[PDB]
Amino acid sequence: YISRYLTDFEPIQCLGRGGFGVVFEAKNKVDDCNYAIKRIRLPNRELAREKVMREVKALAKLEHPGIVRYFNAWLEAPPKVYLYIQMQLCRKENLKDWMNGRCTIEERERSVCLHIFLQIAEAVEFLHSKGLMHRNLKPSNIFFTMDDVVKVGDFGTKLYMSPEQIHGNSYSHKVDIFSLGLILFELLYPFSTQMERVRTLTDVRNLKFPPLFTQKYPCEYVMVQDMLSPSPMERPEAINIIENAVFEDLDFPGKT
Ligand SMILES: COc1cc2nccc(Oc3ccc(NC(=O)c4c(-c5ccncc5)n(C)n(-c5ccccc5)c4=O)nc3)c2cc1OC
Structure with missing residues (x-):
């Protein structure tokens, strides 16, 4: 299995952990910039999953000098399912x-x-x-x-x-x-x-x-x-x- 996160990024450190998941600092190999990467384990509740998928779409539409800058979001399902969100460090x-x-x-x-x-x-x-x-x-x-x-x-x-x-x-x-x-x-x-x-x-x-x-x-x-x-x-x-x-x-x- 090919992990997009491990393929595209060099992990630097774990920034923090919550009930949702984890936030890492990682360097993108291609653009050489350091990012904060939030990884969310998709919940078992289908209505909670609905909320997660909807909120990532809402976040992606947001642009303001006082809002954390969004770059990317993707899903990974290794050999349960994780949503990764890439934002400005x-x-x-x-x-x-x-x-x-x-x-x-x-x-x-x-x-x-x-x-x-x-x-x-x-x-x-x-x-x-x-x-x-x-x-x-x-x-x-x-x-x-x-x-x-x-x-x-x-x-x-x-x-x-x-x-x-x-x-x-x-x-x-x-x-x-x-x-x-x-x-x-x-x-x-x-x-x-x-x-x-x-x-x-x-x-x-x-x-x-x-x-x-x-x-x-x-x-x-x-x-x-x-x-x-x-x-x-x-x-x-x-x-x-x-x-x-x-x-x-x-x-x-x-x-x-
Ligand atoms: C060096 O140390 C650090 C540097 C950090 N640098 C950058 C970011 C850091 O942490 C963050 C901050 C913000 C978020 N997410 C949001 O703000 C999100 C937002 C949102 C954005 C703006 N306003 C409200 C909510 N939403 C809608 N979604 C969302 C929620 C549910 C499901 C799907 C997506 C969000 O993830 N993630 C990580 C850091 C933490 C560090 O130490 C811990």
């Missing part, structure tokens, strides 16, 4: 890592945080304009290119999902706005411990804010409140978030 550190490495307020300068957030929001508004939604927006699903442009993806815990999703109710694109609210807060508010992070984010979910955040960031405090509305209908659209005066003339020393 990003940096090791995702947004969760980035925040974990910047644990002081000095390391979360307003304009820097707003610049990162704006890119995420622009990626989400792109999805919403295409009649798509993310559903699983969280810092660990936010990646950086080698040039630090933020890339929204989905590697595949409940702290970022909308209340309607948690309860297993029907939902709309407004679920992504809820996740955006928590991400904006988390970018602006550094933590020293996981325990502090969990306690504070849980409070913020219920619209209980740390007093120093409300004082230092009145404008983003207002927009986080709006994005975290229990009622999905009263959450703003992503296009309304991106047009907020808060994102007007963002600049910081070292910005491209």
